[PDB]
Amino acid sequence: APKAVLVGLPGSGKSTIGRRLAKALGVGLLDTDVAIEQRTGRSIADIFATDGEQEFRRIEEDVVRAALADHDGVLSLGGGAVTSPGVRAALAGHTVVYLEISAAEGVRRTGGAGPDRAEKYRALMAKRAPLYRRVATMRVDTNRRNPGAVVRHILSRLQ
């Protein structure tokens, strides 16, 4: 079981925090999006473009479940993993850290008719945030905090 399973959208600092948190615990960091390519030997764009989203999600759920069982460090979940009922079920009982950020603050930490970039990012956060809240055992705000301060915060909550 991972020491901590990290969830959050782009702009939340998941990557740095994940790296620093793992180092802080003297454990390893496993990112499922990366693990999906090691597994399949095919990029995410290729698994999607070739096999479709439903196949991609099947592969992702399988990679997550295996990670939840074989990885004992820090596990960083791909943003859409929680949209899978089976992934949400697999996370039951685990330590899940939601690196929470506001839609506006995420926009700021990203970037450079129909909807514009920010409107699209906003709509996605609205659909995902409720789900991150549902599986989280710990919600850590990263709207102002620096990576290092968020890590010290997580550590103070770890078993």
For 156, residues 6+ apart whose C-beta sits below 8 A from its C-beta are: none
Nearest Cα to 65, choosing from 22, 14, 30? 30
CA–CA distance, 6 with 27 (Å, rounded to integer): 14
Secondary-structure class of domain 1-159 per CATH: alpha beta
> How far is CA 126 from each of CA 1, 9, 34, 101, 157, rounded to the nearest angstrom?
29, 11, 25, 12, 27
Residues 64 and 36: their CA atoms lie apart, in Å, by: 9
Domain boundaries, the chain: 1-159
Strand partners, 96: 5
Which residues, in sequence order, are CB contacts of 17 under 8 Å at separation 6+?
A: 6, 99, 142, 147, 150, 151, 154
CA dihedral 118, 122, 123, 129 (to 10 degrees): 150
Resolution in A: 2.0
User: What are the C-alpha distances in Å from 157 to residues 16, 56, 95?
Assistant: 19, 33, 10
Determination technique used:
X-ray
Q: Please report, in range form, the residues annotated as the binding site for substrate.
A: 33, 57, 79, 128
Binding-site residues for ATP:
11-16, 145
Q: After which residues is the chain broken (C to N over 2.5 A)?
A: 112
Q: How far from 40 is each of 52, 60, 67, 73, 151, CA to CA, in Å?
A: 14, 10, 15, 22, 32
Residue 118 to residue 61: CA distance in whole angstroms: 28
Binding-site residue set: 11-16, 33, 57, 79, 128, 145
Q: How many CB atoms lie within 10 A of CB 125?
A: 21
Instruction: List residues forming the annotated binding site for Mg(2+).
Output: 15
